[PDB]
């Protein structure tokens, strides 16, 4: 029924602006305030402000006055937050949310929009297969891997056999070094199934329009 659908990941340079959208469906758009919330990796959740579609009333957290500007388009049931004069402090995941009447609880949340503020340039990943050391493998299981190196900005997606292989997988959060990210993933399967059956890691980096498949081959 009720859904809040946000726009996609952004990368913008310091000093510029970003406009994030929040498309509301399943209810009367003008009846409720659209809330906006900021989340940086380790500063919990912060309330930015809210807008009431239709009348267009706005309320801002003092801390975000002059940083955030809300608008709303009732003809498309879309609310917008513009963040201007961007700095690295503005790098965060931003949520829209919605509750009921007056001071309220946030019953509905958008999926979040990642904003990276950086002067670094967008770079496509290199994807490397990680096959086990030569010779045999411990026991009746084998662990394979995929190394994703040299990309910017987040995110990348990584799956195995186009999602068919989901058990025994660990995908490790990306780490930034010198303006490039590295990510990796391991998958463990029975020796009876590899290399007799193919295992391929599938990596996407939307920011660079990258879609790469690397089949893990035995050494």
């Amino acid at each position: 029924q009720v859904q809040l659908q946000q726009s996609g990941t952004e990368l913008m340079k310091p000093g510029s602006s970003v406009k994030i959208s929040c498309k509301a469906t399943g209810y009367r758009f003008s009846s409720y305030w659209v809330e906006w919330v900021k989340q940086r990796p380790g500063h919990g959740l912060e309330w930015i402000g809210k807008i009431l579609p239709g009348i267009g009333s706005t309320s801002y957290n003092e801390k975000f006055k002059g940083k955030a500007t809300f608008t709303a388009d009732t003809s498309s049931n879309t609310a917008y937050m513009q963040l201007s004069s961007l700095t690295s402090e503005d790098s965060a995941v931003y949520y829209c949310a919605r509750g009921y009447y007056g001071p309220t609880w946030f019953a509905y949340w958008g999926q979040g929009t990642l904003v990276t503020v950086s002067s670094a340039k967008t770079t496509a990943p290199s994807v490397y297969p990680l096959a086990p050391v030569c010779g045999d493998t411990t026991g009746s299981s084998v662990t394979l891997g995929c190394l994703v190196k040299g990309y910017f900005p987040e995110p990348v997606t990584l799956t195995w056999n186009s999602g068919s292989l989901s058990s025994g997988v660990h995908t490790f959060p990306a780490v930034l070094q010198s303006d490039l990210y590295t990510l990796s993933s391991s998958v463990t399967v029975t020796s009876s199934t590899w290399p007799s059956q193919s295992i391929t890691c599938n990596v996407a980096h939307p920011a660079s329009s990258t879609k790469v498949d690397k089949k893990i081959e035995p050494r």
């Binding site: 912060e46 096959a131 190394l147 070094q177």
Partner: protein, 211 residues
């Protein structure tokens, strides 16, 4: 401008035990709401108006509180409860607590170590990363030591831990040692050693480049 403080920042809970997460306010609060945020997901309403259970939320969650002090109780902790939890109130405007991470205290578990030499693809590009996966261990702290021909190497290492697993309550971590192709060809034996609470003995995997 009512500040919400959640302490401890990380709360350990054994499976099947009752645990109470708390939220203290700098002045009196009318009602507190609570959200759960599992790894990689949006916050999800658990409790609203101090004690009302949000739709679909298991009855093992409950809320209570009054004045400056509020509580979220889980009656019998389960592995899927590994998450961050936030309190939330309104007085003039909304504030949130800094969050508490519920850490599931499962049985201690040793890591399973796997090592991977550079791919031919990377070597062609003049780079050489060696990767070590330390999988399914508990608790989270773990030490990884890289040795090249028997000597510790510290520079060029990138480590990444997963968040606690929602099913088995373990952690995993990946360590990548990145060398130039020339530096990699300069030596032969590549070893990753994992030292974890579970033993004073390091858990090791090794290979030789020339093999």
């Amino acid at each position: 401008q009512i500040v919400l403080t959640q302490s401890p920042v990380i709360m350990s809970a054994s499976l099947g035990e009752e645990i109470t997460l708390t939220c203290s306010a700098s002045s009196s609060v009318s009602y507190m709401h609570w959200y759960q945020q599992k790894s990689g997901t949006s916050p999800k309403l658990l409790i609203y108006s101090t004690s009302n259970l949000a739709s679909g939320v298991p009855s093992r969650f409950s809320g209570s509180g009054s004045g400056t002090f509020y509580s979220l109780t889980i009656s019998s902790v389960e592995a899927e409860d590994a998450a961050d939890y936030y309190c939330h109130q309104w007085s003039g405007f909304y504030t949130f607590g800094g969050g508490t991470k519920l850490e599931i205290q499962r049985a201690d578990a040793a890591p399973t170590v796997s090592i991977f030499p550079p791919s031919s693809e990377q070597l062609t590009s003049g780079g050489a990363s060696v990767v070590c996966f330390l999988n399914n261990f508990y608790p989270k702290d773990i030490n990884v030591k890289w040795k090249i021909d028997g000597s510790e190497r510290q520079n060029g290492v990138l480590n990444s831990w997963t968040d606690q697993d929602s099913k088995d309550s373990t952690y995993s971590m990946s360590s990548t040692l990145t060398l130039t192709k020339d530096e990699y060809e300069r030596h032969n034996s590549y070893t990753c050693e994992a030292t974890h609470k579970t033993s004073t003995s390091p858990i090791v995997k090794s290979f030789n480049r020339n093999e």
